[PDB]
From a paper:
However, the vertebrate-specific CUL9 complex with RBX1 (also called ROC1), of interest due to its tumor suppressive interaction with TP53, uniquely encompasses both cullin–RING and RBR domains. However, the vertebrate-specific CUL9 is unique in encompassing two distinct types of E3 ligase within the same polypeptide. With 2,517 residues, CUL9 is the largest cullin and RBR protein, and among the dozen largest E3 ligase subunits, and its structural mechanisms have remained elusive. The CUL9 structure distinctly encompasses both neddylated CRL and RBR E3 functionalities within a single polypeptide, in a giant triangular, hexameric self-assembly.
Superimposing homologous regions of protomer A (unneddylated) on protomer B (neddylated) and vice versa show that the hexamer could be formed by either a fully unneddylated or neddylated complex, the former also observed in a map obtained through symmetry expansion. One of the most abundant cross-links (K188 with K188 in the ARM1 dimerization interface) was absent in XL–MS for the ‘monomer’ mutant. It is noteworthy that unneddylated CUL9K1881R–RBX1 remained hexameric. Examination of the structure showed that the arrangement of CUL9’s WHB domain and RBX1 RING would require reorientation to achieve the conformation for neddylation. Structural modeling of UBE2F on RBX1’s RING in the unneddylated protomer A suggests that neddylation requires yet another CUL9–RBX1 conformation.
Residue numbers in the entry:
A (entry chain B): 10 to 29, 32 to 46, 61 to 73
B (entry chain A): 1481 to 1667, 1691 to 1739, 1750 to 1821, 1830 to 1836, 1845 to 1858, 1864 to 1902, 1921 to 1952
C (entry chain C): 21 to 35, 40 to 61, 66 to 108
D (entry chain B): 1302 to 1434, 1465 to 1628
E (entry chain B): 2296 to 2316, 2326 to 2355, 2361 to 2387, 2403 to 2430
Write the structure that this text describes.
C-alpha cells in the first residue's frame, strides 16, 4: 500500500527492524519514500 | 380638468365618492378614445387633468379624500377575502378600479394616503394573515407610497418566520450542550408563535402595551415569552410585549377565534362563574374604551358570554371586533409649522439659495418629522408660489 | 372550560452625524476635507438616512446595500 | 534550519495520521455502532494537536500548515471510508442518518434512548463539517445525504401513491426532511441542492402509469385549494396559506419527464376555473410562483 | 398491496420493453423467462385479490423484489447456470402453488 504523503511523494513499507506502553510490543517498521527512508514505530493493530 | 373639479367640489362628502370617481375616469377615457382615436398624448393629458384638479383643493378636503381612498381599498380587500360568490366580483372590480387611484403618485397627497393606509393594513395583517392579496395590490400600486412603509411591513412578517426557525435551532443546541455536560462529567400544549415588529414601519399605539406580563397571563405563557426574550437577547434591542394578536380557543365542540384581550378575559373566566367589570379594569390596567370594544362582540348574539354589568355564562364562531374606521372631522398644524420654518430658513439663508437635501437636514435639526413630510411641505410651497428652483442650479431653492 | 390551541404573540422592538465618514451632519466631507478646495451635497434615501454624496458614491461603488440598515439603497426621487 | 524541519515534521505527521485513520476505519467497519464513540476520539486528537501547535510553533502560518496536514491526513480517508457503499448499499454514515430520521419522531421525551442517539449524531456531523468553507469531505457527505433522502422518498412513493392524502403527506415529508437536514448539517446550500436532487431521482425511478397518476394528483390538489380559497370564508383564507407553503415541494417537477403530463392536466382544470370565475388574482399569483414548471407556457 | 401492484406494473413494463428491444445472453434469457412467469403469477394474484399470512406476504414481496431486480439487471446487461435454473424452477413452483391456492379459494 503506497500511502500518499503529498503531491509528489508516496510511501511503502520494507521490513521489521526490532520489537519492543500497552504491554504489547511495537515494530520499528522502515518506510521507503518514492518521489530518504523514514523509521516509524507502529503498534500491532496499526501494522496489521 | 374643469369636469373633474366640478365633480370633486360637488360631491366629496357622499359615501359613494370613490365609485363615482372611478366611473368618471372610465367614462372620460372612453370619450377621449372615441373622439381622438387611441393615442398616448391624450392619455397623458387625462392624467394631468385629474392631477391638477386634485391639487387645486383645500387641505381638509384633500385629507378627507385620502382617507376615503384607503377605506375603499380596505373594504374591497376584506369583502373579497371573506365572502363567497360576490367576493370574486368585488375583487375583479377592485383590480379594475386601481388605475384611477394611481393618479396620486408623486402628488402632495401621497403622504397622507400612506399614513392612512398603514392603519388599515395593520389591522388586516393582524386579524387575517399576510395574504397574497396584499402583495398583489402592492405590486400594482406600490409606487404611490413615498417612504415605502407597507413593503417594510410585509418584510417584517417574513423576518419573524426566519426568527422562528433560528429559535428552534438555538434551543436544540442548548439541549445538546447540556446533554454533553451531563454525559462527560458522568463518564397537550398550546402552540405559541411570536411576531417581532419594527417601530419604524408599524404604527403601534403607546396604549396597547403589556408592562408586567406575569401579573396578567398564566405562568406557562409567561415562561414561553421569557424563553424567547432570552434568545432574542443572546442573539442580538429589547422586547416590549403588546396586547395585539389572535388566538384559537376550544369551548365544548365550538372552535372560537378571539383577540388577545378576549382570550385573556375568557381564560380568567374559566375559574369562576361570574366576573365584575370594575375588578377586570383594576386588574388589567388598560384603556376602558379598549375593554369595551373587546367585550362588545362577546355579550352579543351567538356569543359565549352574557351580561347582567356582571359577566356570566350565557348557555366556528369568529368573534373578532370589526375595524372601526377613522373619521377626519393635527396634520394641518404640522404642515403649517413645517411650511413656516421652511420659509424662515429659506429667507434667512440668503438669496444664494440652499440644497434641498441639506434643507431637509436643516429642517429636521430645527424641529429637533420625516423627510417625506418636509418634502411634501416643500412641494406645497412651490405650488402655492412662495419659492422656486434656481434655473442655473435646480437644487438651489430661491425664495420669491 | 377553555383550551388554548394556538396563540400569536406580538412584540415591538425598541432601542446622528454622517456616520459613514463621521463628520458633522451638516459639515463637509472628510475625504475632500483632506483635499481642501467641499463639493459633496447631502444625499437622502428611502430608508430615511442622510449621507454625503461622496461617501455614498464610493461606498456604493464598492457594495450595494445601505450601510446602516441592510437594505438595497434607493436614491430618493420623491418631491424632486 | 527551518525548511528541513518543516519537511520532516510534515512528512512524519502525515504518515502517522494516515496509518491511524486506516486503523480507526477498519475498526468502524466491523461494528457499525461505533461512530457514536468516534466523536470523542477525534475531539482528543484535535485538542492535543492544537495544544502542541500553540506551545511550540510561533508563526500563525506554521500553525495553519500543521493543522491542514493533520486534518487532511486523518479526517479525509476516514470520511471516504465510512461513507462508501457496501455490496447491499448501506454505508456506515448512511445507516446512522437513516436511523436518526426513523427515530426522530420518538425523540421528544428528553429522557429516553432516542434523545441521546439524536444528540450524538448531531454533534458528530457538526464536527465533520466544522471546517468547510468543494473539498473531498463535503462532497462525500453530500452524496450520502442524497442517498438517504432518495431511499426515504422512494419508500414513501412506492408505499402510498393511491390514497387521497398523497399530496399533503408528500409536502409534510418534504418539510420534515428539510428541517432534519438543517439541524444536522447547519444551514447550507449544497445540502438543499442534495435534497432536491434526491426527490427528483426518487420521482424519476418510477413507472409511467404511476407518474401519470401522481401528476393528476398534483393538478387536482392545486385546483381544489384554489376553488376553496376563493369560495369559502375563514377556512378558505386559512387554506390559501397552506397552498402557498406547499408549492415549493411541487416545483421539483421543473424539468423532468413528468412536466408534460402535469401541464396537460393543469390545462384541463384551469379551463373550467376560468370559465366559471374570472381571471382572478389567484391564478396570476400561482403562475408567478410555479411558472417555470411548464414547458410550453 | 399498493407496493406489490406498483412492483408488478413496473416488472410488466420492463418485460414489455425487453421484448420490444455467450453464457451471459443465455443467463439473461433464462432470467427474463423466469421474470415473465413470475409477473404472470403476480398479475393472477392481484386479480384474485381484487375479486402464516404475514410470512406468506413477506415471501411474496421478496419474490417480487427479486424478480424486479433480476429484470432490471437483465435490462442493464443488454454455478451461475445452476443458480438460474433453480431460481426458474422455484418461480414456476411458486406460480403453480399460487394458482392451486386460487383454484381452491374460488
Ligand atoms: Zn460623510
Ligand atoms: Zn465630500
Ligand atoms: Zn438606511
Amino acid at each position: 500500500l503506497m500511502v500518499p504523503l503529498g503531491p509528489r511523494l508516496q510511501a511503502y513499507p520494507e521490513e521489521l527492524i526490532r520489537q519492543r506502553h500497552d504491554g504489547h510490543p511495537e515494530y520499528l517498521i522502515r518506510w521507503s519514500v518514492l518521489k530518504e527512508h523514514i523509521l516509524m514505530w507502529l503498534s500491532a493493530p496499526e501494522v496489521y | 380638468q374643469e369636469q373633474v373639479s366640478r365633480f370633486l367640489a360637488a360631491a366629496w362628502r357622499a359615501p359613494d365618492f370613490v365609485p363615482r370617481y372611478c366611473k368618471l375616469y372610465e367614462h372620460l377615457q372612453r370619450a377621449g378614445s372615441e373622439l381622438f382615436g387611441p393615442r398616448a398624448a391624450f392619455m397623458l393629458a387625462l392624467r394631468s387633468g385629474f392631477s391638477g384638479a386634485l391639487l387645486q383643493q383645500s387641505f381638509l378636503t384633500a385629507a378627507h379624500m385620502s382617507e376615503q381612498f384607503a377605506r375603499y381599498i380596505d373594504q374591497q380587500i376584506q369583502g373579497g377575502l371573506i365572502g363567497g360568490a360576490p367576493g370574486v366580483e368585488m375583487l375583479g372590480q377592485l383590480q379594475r378600479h386601481l388605475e384611477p387611484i394611481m393618479v396620486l403618485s408623486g402628488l402632495e397627497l401621497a403622504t397622507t394616503f400612506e399614513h392612512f393606509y398603514q392603519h388599515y393594513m395593520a389591522d388586516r395583517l393582524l386579524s387575517f394573515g399576510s395574504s397574497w392579496l396584499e402583495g398583489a395590490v402592492l405590486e400594482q400600486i406600490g409606487l404611490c407610497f413615498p417612504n415605502r412603509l407597507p413593503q417594510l411591513m410585509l418584510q417584517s412578517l417574513s423576518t419573524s418566520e426566519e426568527l422562528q426557525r433560528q429559535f428552534h435551532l438555538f434551543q436544540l443546541q442548548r439541549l445538546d450542550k447540556l446533554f454533553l455536560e451531563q454525559e462527560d462529567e458522568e463518564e397537550p400544549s398550546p402552540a405559541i408563535s411570536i411576531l417581532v415588529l419594527s417601530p419604524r414601519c408599524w404604527p403601534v399605539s403607546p396604549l396597547c402595551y403589556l408592562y408586567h406580563p406575569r401579573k396578567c397571563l398564566p405562568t406557562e405563557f409567561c415562561d414561553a415569552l421569557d424563553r424567547f426574550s432570552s434568545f432574542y437577547s443572546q442573539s442580538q434591542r429589547r422586547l416590549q410585549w403588546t396586547w395585539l394578536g389572535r388566538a384559537e380557543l376550544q369551548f365544548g365542540k365550538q372552535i372560537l377565534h378571539v383577540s388577545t384581550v378576549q382570550m385573556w378575559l375568557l381564560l380568567k373566566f374559566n375559574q369562576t362563574e361570574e366576573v365584575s367589570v370594575e375588578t377586570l379594569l383594576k386588574d388589567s390596567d388598560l384603556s376602558p374604551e379598549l375593554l369595551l370594544q373587546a367585550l362588545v362582540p362577546l355579550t352579543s348574539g351567538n356569543g359565549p358570554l352574557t351580561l347582567h354589568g356582571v359577566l356570566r355564562l350565557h348557555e366556528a364562531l369568529w368573534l373578532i371586533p370589526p375595524q372601526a374606521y377613522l373619521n377626519v372631522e393635527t396634520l394641518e398644524q404640522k404642515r403649517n409649522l413645517l411650511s413656516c420654518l421652511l420659509v424662515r430658513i429659506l429667507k434667512a439663508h440668503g438669496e444664494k439659495g440652499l440644497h434641498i437635501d441639506q434643507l431637509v437636514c436643516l429642517v429636521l435639526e430645527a424641529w429637533q418629522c420625516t423627510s417625506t413630510d418636509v418634502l411634501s411641505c416643500i412641494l406645497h410651497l412651490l405650488g402655492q408660489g412662495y419659492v422656486k428652483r434656481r434655473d442655473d442650479r435646480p437644487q438651489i431653492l430661491m425664495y420669491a | 372550560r377553555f383550551e388554548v390551541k394556538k396563540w400569536n404573540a406580538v412584540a415591538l422592538w425598541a432601542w446622528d452625524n454622517c456616520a459613514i465618514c463621521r463628520n458633522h451632519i451638516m459639515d463637509l466631507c472628510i475625504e475632500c476635507q483632506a483635499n481642501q478646495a467641499e463639493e459633496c451635497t447631502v444625499a437622502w434615501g428611502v430608508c430615511n438616512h442622510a449621507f454625503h454624496f461622496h461617501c455614498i458614491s464610493r461606498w456604493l461603488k464598492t457594495r450595494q446595500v445601505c450601510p446602516l440598515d441592510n437594505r438595497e439603497w434607493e436614491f430618493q426621487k420623491y418631491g424632486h | 534550519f527551518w525548511p528541513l524541519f518543516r519537511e520532516q515534521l510534515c512528512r512524519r505527521t502525515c504518515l502517522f495520521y494516515t496509518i491511524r485513520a486506516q486503523a480507526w476505519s477498519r475498526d468502524i467497519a466491523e461494528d457499525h455502532r461505533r461512530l457514536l464513540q468516534l466523536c470523542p476520539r477525534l475531539n482528543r486528537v484535535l485538542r492535543h494537536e492544537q495544544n502542541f501547535a500553540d506551545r511550540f510553533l510561533p508563526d500563525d502560518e506554521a500553525a495553519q500548515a500543521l493543522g491542514k496536514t493533520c486534518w487532511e491526513a486523518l479526517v479525509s480517508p476516514l470520511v471516504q471510508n465510512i461513507t462508501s457503499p457496501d455490496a447491499e448499499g448501506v454505508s456506515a454514515l448512511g445507516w446512522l442518518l437513516d436511523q436518526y430520521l426513523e427515530q426522530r419522531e420518538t425523540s421528544r421525551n428528553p429522557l429516553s434512548r432516542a434523545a441521546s442517539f439524536a444528540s450524538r449524531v448531531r454533534r458528530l456531523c457538526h464536527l465533520l463539517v466544522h471546517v468547510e468553507p468543494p473539498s473531498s469531505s463535503l462532497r462525500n457527505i453530500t452524496q450520502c445525504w442524497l442517498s438517504v433522502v432518495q431511499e426515504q422518498v422512494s419508500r414513501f412513493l412506492a408505499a402510498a401513491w393511491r390514497a387521497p392524502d398523497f399530496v399533503p403527506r408528500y409536502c409534510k415529508l418534504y418539510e420534515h426532511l428539510q428541517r432534519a437536514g438543517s439541524e444536522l448539517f447547519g444551514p447550507r446550500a449544497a445540502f438543499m441542492l442534495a435534497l432536491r436532487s434526491g426527490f427528483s431521482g426518487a420521482l424519476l425511478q418510477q413507472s409511467f402509469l404511476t407518474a401519470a397518476h401522481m401528476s393528476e394528483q398534483f393538478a387536482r390538489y392545486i385546483d381544489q385549494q384554489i376553488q376553496g380559497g376563493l369560495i369559502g370564508g375563514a377556512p378558505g383564507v386559512e387554506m390559501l396559506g397552506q397552498l402557498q407553503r406547499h408549492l415549493e415541494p411541487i416545483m421539483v417537477l421543473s424539468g423532468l419527464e413528468l412536466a408534460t403530463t402535469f401541464e396537460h392536466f393543469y390545462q384541463h382544470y384551469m379551463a373550467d376555473r376560468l370559465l366559471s370565475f374570472g381571471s382572478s388574482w389567484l391564478e396570476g399569483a400561482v403562475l408567478e410562483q410555479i411558472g417555470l414548471c411548464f414547458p410550453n407556457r | 398491496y399498493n407496493e406489490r401492484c406498483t412492483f408488478h406494473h413496473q416488472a410488466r413494463e420492463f418485460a414489455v420493453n425487453l421484448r420490444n428491444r455467450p453464457r451471459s445472453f443465455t443467463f439473461l434469457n433464462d432470467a427474463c423467462q423466469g421474470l415473465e412467469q413470475a409477473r404472470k403469477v403476480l398479475a393472477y394474484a392481484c386479480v384474485y385479490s381484487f375479486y402464516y399470512m404475514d410470512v406468506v406476504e413477506q415471501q411474496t414481496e421478496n419474490l417480487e423484489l427479486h424478480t424486479n431486480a433480476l429484470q432490471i439487471l437483465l435490462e442493464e446487461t443488454l454455478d451461475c447456470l445452476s443458480t438460474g435454473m433453480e431460481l426458474l424452477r422455484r418461480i414456476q413452483e411458486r406460480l403453480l402453488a399460487i394458482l392451486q391456492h386460487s383454484a381452491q379459494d374460488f
